[PDB]
Ligand binder design. Structure first.
Ligand SMILES: [Mg+2]
Ligand SMILES: [Mg+2]
Length: 268
């Protein structure tokens, strides 16, 4: 039987989601199983679980980010520069690789969307505008980003059948860790400024491996290794949401753990 909205809501409360919470979800839809109305049912369930004073923050990115196409160049290659669409937060679809739920989140009425095309975040709830801005180039996941404000806002990470590599907030630990050898990347994004396309080139921390030993394309990256160690070392509520093994994680706690984890292992 397809999972109903009200069944999902009871499971979320069993897991510890309370009215008023600030939740960032990472979802494996195939793990959850058939829903009564497809993925919207789970989006509906999450909005109901956090209530009208609660907030959802999701890492949605952009289906057509020109990250790899501009990676490593001090300007976008001519053919990219001429024809790439400017990022338009009202119409740019979500990146499919983080899960099909994120397109449903970002098109929810009243959803706000942050201005960073590659790191774009969507937020639903009364604090959404405060969560999504500022989001400037060169500050994808660290201080001054939506992840930073989420960590200051009692944020909980809701992993619904997702792996330990999925925890976006740990890129904040990578950004502030006092470790030698931190990898950076250079890329370019096309922004809308007054409705004209403007190409902006920036550097930021490499989010595909903060150090060489974590940059193997198959992993494990540092996010996976930190989260795997954290979950073996911490009491975290675990339970089903739909058919999926799910956990509800204290975001500030896992990020503080990750900062200490990196600084213990790598000289300053
Ligand atoms: Mg909209
Ligand atoms: Mg509030």
């Amino acid at each position: 039987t397809p999972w109903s909205k009200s069944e999902l809501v009871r499971q979320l409360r069993d897991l510890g989601v309370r009215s008023g919470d600030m939740v960032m979800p990472h979802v494996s839809l195939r793990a959850v199983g058939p829903l009564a109305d497809g993925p919207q049912t789970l989006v509906d369930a999450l909005i109901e679980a956090v209530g009208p004073t609660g907030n959802i923050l999701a890492f949605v990115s952009w289906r057509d980010s020109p990250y790899e196409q501009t990676l490593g160049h001090d300007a976008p290659p001519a053919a990219i520069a001429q024809s790439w669409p400017a990022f338009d937060p009202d119409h740019a679809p979500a990146y499919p690789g983080f899960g099909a739920i994120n397109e449903f989140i970002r098109t929810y009425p009243g959803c706000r969307r942050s201005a960073h095309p590659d790191a774009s975040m969507a937020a639903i709830g009364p604090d959404a505008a405060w969560l999504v801005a500022p989001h400037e180039m060169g500050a994808a996941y660290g201080p001054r980003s939506p992840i930073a404000r989420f960590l200051a806002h009692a944020g909980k990470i809701l992993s619904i059948g997702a792996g330990p590599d999925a925890v976006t907030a740990l890129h904040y630990a990578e950004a502030v860790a006092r470790i030698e050898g931190k990898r950076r990347v250079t890329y370019s994004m096309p922004l809308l400024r007054e409705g004209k396309r403007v190409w902006v080139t920036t550097s930021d921390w490499d989010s595909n491996g903060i150090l060489d030993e974590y940059a193997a394309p198959d992993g494990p990256d540092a996010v996976e290794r930190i989260a795997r160690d954290y979950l073996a070392r911490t009491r975290v509520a675990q339970g089903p949401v739909g058919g999926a093994q799910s956990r509800l994680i204290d975001a500030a706690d896992i990020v503080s753990f990750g900062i200490e984890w990196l600084e213990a292992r790598h000289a300053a």
